[PDB]
Amino acid sequence: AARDLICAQKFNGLTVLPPLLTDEMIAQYTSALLAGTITSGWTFGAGAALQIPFAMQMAYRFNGIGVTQNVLYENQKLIANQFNSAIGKIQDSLSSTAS
Amino acid sequence: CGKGYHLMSFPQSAPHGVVFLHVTYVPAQEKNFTTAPAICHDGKAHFPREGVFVSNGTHWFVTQRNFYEPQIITTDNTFVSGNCDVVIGIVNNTVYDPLQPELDSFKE
Ligand SMILES: *[C@@H]1O[C@H](CO)[C@@H](O[C@@H]2O[C@H](CO)[C@@H](O)[C@H](O)[C@H]2NC(C)=O)[C@H](O)[C@H]1NC(C)=O
Ligand SMILES: *[C@@H]1O[C@H](CO)[C@@H](O)[C@H](O)[C@H]1NC(C)=O
Ligand SMILES: *[C@@H]1O[C@H](CO)[C@@H](O)[C@H](O)[C@H]1NC(C)=O
């Protein structure tokens, strides 16, 4: 085709170096963090990862706010459906708006 | 303030800087247990006050989260909220009442 801008930058002595960590390694780190925070809660960030069921972890996180844990166990389908709708809206917001 | 659960920190001087000695608490020796969210006893659902329900294989205890010491499931360390058909994962266990032995002894 024609002379690209990056070819002119390369010919004039300007170089871009690649990063040390590839995008696959960043994705592996992110997946490890997600798996730890889903399966073990906050315990993997303070020592050995200790497993806990997710409803019980969410009840602990409600006691961290000020709401007693009987609220979640008697409404678990409602929090589950609200979270599913809220995370489904993120995909619809990201598939259209580029700002 | 350091990795783990923070307890203390001590400063020290250094040329053009400071050095913090962070004293933290780390859990060490874990073991598996079977757990439940609530106890369905006498048509009522019991939830722990400050703790979690565990089983050593046959019996059910309530314990704190960051350390393992078990104790008997009691009305004093639990609370009641509704009936046991809404919570998913309930198990069946008796709940001790400390009032009743002294109450019946006063009754007789
Ligand atoms: C689970 O814990 C309970 C409470 O400590 C155990 O019950 C007691 O176990 C001791 C140890 O042999 C016995 O001497 C007692 O007679 C038991 N008491 C009762 C009321 O059973 C129980 O054995 C433990 N179960 C397992 C599988 O370790
Ligand atoms: C708990 O159970 C898992 C799977 O059964 C096993 O790999 C592990 O060694 C057990 N003990 C601890 C302390 O996690
Ligand atoms: C617990 O006890 C109730 C009646 O007291 C019974 O209907 C229920 O099936 C029991 N739960 C299990 C898991 O057996």
UniProtKB/Swiss-Prot annotation, chain B:
Q: So which domain of life are we looking at?
A: Viruses
Protein name per the record = Spike protein S2'
Variant or mutagenesis effect after changing residue 29 to H: In strain: Kappa/B.1.617.1
Question: What happens when you mutate residue 76 to H?
Answer: In strain: Alpha/B.1.1.7
Instruction: Describe the function of this protein.
Output: Subunit of the fusion protein that is processed upon entry into the host cell. Mediates fusion of the virion and cellular membranes by functioning as a class I viral fusion protein. Contains a viral fusion peptide that is unmasked after S2 cleavage. This cleavage can occur at the cell membrane by host TMPRSS2 or during endocytosis by host CSTL. In either case, this triggers an extensive and irreversible conformational change that leads to fusion of the viral envelope with the cellular cytoplasmic membrane, releasing viral genomic RNA into the host cell cytoplasm.
Q: What is the effect of changing residue 59 to Y?
A: In strain: Theta/P.3
Traced from the root, the source organism's taxonomic lineage reads: Viruses, Riboviria, Orthornavirae, Pisuviricota, Pisoniviricetes
Q: Which residues are glycosylated?
A: 32, 56, 92
Query: Where in the chain are disulfide-linked cysteines found?
Result: 40-84
